Symmetry: C2
Subunit: 149 residues, 2 copies
């Protein structure tokens, strides 16, 4: 569980928001890109894996699952690339709910920045610090630390 | 403190590499930018603070210390902005040594990517996973987890 991440792609203002969620904690990382390509997805995973111990990634769709560039980045970074098929049917709605919540937070900060990418990073901050009573940021560190010890 | 980070700026291939180092662990995050502006530095800190519990940032120079954009981002993110003056004289050489090591790693991966930004992220990965026997990635998580508990 502590090394499992899920990729997610959502759209806003004619742009793409690429999201990685740490499944056990709800912690997220996100970036804005013009469009979802293998190359952008590969780069995003390289960034992620340098920052957290990414063991397994459930890809967000078949194109990223198939992409040789993505497969190469996963090989390079020591990541097991898997499908994101909701074998547990709960996963479709959970991703839906996350995107809705993320977009809500983005709406709450949107006027504090000119560029969407900035609003997205503010939303990542707010999401990861929100107390649920631990935050997602606290949960991910605790989960991984316990795994190391 | 577990919340203390140091900003660092170095140059390669006519571009700027902006680095944040977690002082207690040696863990790093980095990005390539065309040039170091207040705006780029502010954005980098917003990204960092959404991902790790950043309490204090020692800025890399007086322009970023002075920048109203940087000060605004620090206020927004709940970061105490401080100078980076080596009151301990050892800090100048330690940063120097880090940049030299980072550039060495970049050289070792440079031919595996077209774009410098990609090589920099590969170097971040290698640095953060390198054992010596825990890695920087392991140390940062352990330090912060202990702080939470
Ligand atoms: O509000 C949300 O649903 C939400 C989540 C939910 N999340 C978890 O806690 C565990 C998990 C696994 C897979 C997908 C999502 C989740 C996570 C991040 C969010 C959420 O709203 C905004 O950012
Ligand atoms: O060439 C780039 O800079 C680049 C790459 C390169 N690349 C692959 O095609 C497969 C791979 C595995 C590990 C590391 C790098 C690569 C991939 C994605 C990129 C690249 O520039 C921006 O986004
Ligand atoms: O406007 C942007 O998108 C942007 C900003 C905006 N900004 C400030 O000027 C001060 C501040 C504090 C907290 C959040 C945002 C801002 C800053 C940096 C940027 C921005 O676009 C890219 O880099
Ligand atoms: O080789 C390096 O010096 C290096 C460091 C050093 N580092 C720590 O271990 C603790 C610390 C506090 C303040 C500044 C630097 C450090 C860190 C990161 C690196 C280093 O080489 C490449 O990436």
């Amino acid at each position: 569980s502590p090394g499992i991440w899920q990729l997610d792609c959502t759209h806003l203002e004619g742009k793409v928001i690429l999201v990685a969620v740490h499944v056990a904690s709800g912690y997220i990382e996100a970036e804005v890109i013009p469009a979802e390509t293998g190359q952008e997805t590969a780069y995003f995973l390289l960034k992620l894996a340098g920052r957290w111990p990414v063991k397994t990634v459930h890809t967000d769709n078949g194109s990223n699952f198939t992409s040789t560039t993505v497969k190469a980045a996963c090989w390079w970074a020591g990541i097991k690339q898997e499908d994101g098929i909701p074998y547990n049917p709960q996963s479709q709605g959970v991703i839906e709910s996350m995107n809705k919540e993320l977009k809500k937070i983005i709406g709450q900060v949107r006027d504090q920045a000119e560029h969407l990418k900035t609003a997205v990073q503010m939303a990542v901050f707010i999401h990861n610090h929100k107390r649920k009573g631990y935050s997602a940021g606290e949960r991910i560190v605790d989960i991984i630390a316990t795994d190391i010890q």
